[PDB]
Amino acid sequence: ERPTFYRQELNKTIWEVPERYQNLSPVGSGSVCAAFDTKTGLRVAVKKLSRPFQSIIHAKRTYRELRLLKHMKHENVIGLLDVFTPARSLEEFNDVYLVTHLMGADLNNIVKSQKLTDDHVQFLIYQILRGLKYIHSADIIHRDLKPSNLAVNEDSELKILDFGVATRWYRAPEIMLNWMHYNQTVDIWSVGCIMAELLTGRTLFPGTDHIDQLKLILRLVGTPGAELLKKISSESARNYIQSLTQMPKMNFANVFIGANPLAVDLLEKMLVLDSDKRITAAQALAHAYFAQYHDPDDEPVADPYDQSLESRDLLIDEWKSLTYDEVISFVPPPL
Numbered sequence: 001e002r003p004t005f006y007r008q009e010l011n012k013t014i015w016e017v018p019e020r021y022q023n024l025s026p027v028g029s030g031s032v033c034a035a036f037d038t039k040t041g042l043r044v045a046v047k048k049l050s051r052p053f054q055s056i057i058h059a060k061r062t063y064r065e066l067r068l069l070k071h072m073k074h075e076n077v078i079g080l081l082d083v084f085t086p087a088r089s090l091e092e093f094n095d096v097y098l099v100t101h102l103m104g105a106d107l108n109n110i111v112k113s114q115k116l117t118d119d120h121v122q123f124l125i126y127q128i129l130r131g132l133k134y135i136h137s138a139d140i141i142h143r144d145l146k147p148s149n150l151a152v153n154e155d156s157e158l159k160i161l162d163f164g165v166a167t168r169w170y171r172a173p174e175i176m177l178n179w180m181h182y183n184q185t186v187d188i189w190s191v192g193c194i195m196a197e198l199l200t201g202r203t204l205f206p207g208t209d210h211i212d213q214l215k216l217i218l219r220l221v222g223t224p225g226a227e228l229l230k231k232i233s234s235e236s237a238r239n240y241i242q243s244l245t246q247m248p249k250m251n252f253a254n255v256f257i258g259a260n261p262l263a264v265d266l267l268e269k270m271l272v273l274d275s276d277k278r279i280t281a282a283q284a285l286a287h288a289y290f291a292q293y294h295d296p297d298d299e300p301v302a303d304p305y306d307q308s309l310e311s312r313d314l315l316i317d318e319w320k321s322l323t324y325d326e327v328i329s330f331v332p333p334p335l
């Protein structure tokens with residue numbers, strides 16, 4: 001039975017939440033308050049979705065995020081503690097609030113404050129890969145992995161999230177090249193870029209645009225081979241590649257001066273241009289670099305996820321009814 005809600009106005013924005021959530025305090029831009037979950041004891045983030053049914057793009061996005069977060073159940077992936085609306089019927093349904101564990105800092109804050117030890121990088125990259133094995137096993141590709149999409153607490157425990165520094169800096173070259181298809185290993189490229197930055201304290205590929213971005217990448221990994229050229233479906237992309245002055249692959253050891261050679265070797269297996277040859281998250285977890293963490297009995301996979309549902313062509317009112325149903329059917333986690 002519906003809980004008692006209380007209204008209050010914060011940061012230019014209304015908030016109507018169950019009395020279960022106390023001491024709401026804004027933490028920025030939808031928009032988010034920190035709160036105390038009186039029921040469970042936990043500090044929470046309550047995210048109020050921004051104009052969730054504004055358009056078919058917003059309505060679909062709202063549905064997709066709710067559906068996904070409800071399905072994510074893993075230590076290294078953001079999970080849903082609660083989802084609510086102050087509306088007591090579909091007819092008055094306009095607002096969606098998502099609740100998750102409050103997060104202190106993102107990886108940016110840790111590397112922008114420091115440069116990390118190899119021990120610390122092992123543990124953080126291990127966890128990103130473990131969460132990705134899970135996400136990937138559900139046939140979900142993150143596509144926007146970057147330090148700010150990684151929450152890290154005081155215990156160095158890490159969770160992958162998607163909050164929505166350029167995204168381009170962490171993006172696999174095939175995305176720069178507007179490839180229509182791409183596999184799960186686009187996310188491995190990003191982990192490669194993140195791990196590099198954590199080990200050196202510098203953005204590996206700080207491109208100013210997409211062409212510059214490819215320039216900086218090819219400078220390290222070398223221009224495509226004849227085996228890779230054969231795999232390019234775009235006549236226009238294919239021409240551009242063949243028009244380049246060949247650059248050789250660099251020796252990563254000669255670039256990541258001082259880093260652990262196993263870290264370097266792992267980077268060599270992640271930052272491969274041919275994505276068919278890039279290491280997968282599950283193979284990565286078994287690399288010698290993660291020897292002290294890797295446990296094949298404790299790196300679980302996800303239940304299968306149906307992406308067709310969020311991809312349909314429906315009316316705003318229909319996405320809205322579908323989102324309402326997802327709110328109503330929420331089953332909370334065990335505390």
Ligand SMILES: Cc1cccc(-n2nc(C(C)(C)C)cc2NC(=O)Nc2ccc(Nc3ccnc4ccc(N)cc34)cc2)c1
Nearest residue numbers: 027028032045047064065078101102103160161162163164
């Ligand atoms: C926008 C969108 C649409 C569809 C899916 C996602 N998405 N996808 C994922 C995975 C499963 C692929 C990794 C996760 C999400 N969504 C997501 O992470 N949502 C989310 C909710 C709240 C937050 N905000 C905060 C969460 C926790 N603490 C915070 C502290 C301060 C602050 N300013 C914000 C937060 C960040 C992300 C995101």
Ligand SMILES: CCCCCCCCO[C@@H]1O[C@H](CO)[C@@H](O)[C@H](O)[C@H]1O
Nearest residue numbers: 173174181182183231273274275276
């Ligand atoms: C200069 C940049 C070269 C781009 C090479 C990226 C990897 C190309 O390799 C291809 O990746 C595609 C996307 O997943 C897939 O369709 C193919 O399975 C794969 O052969």
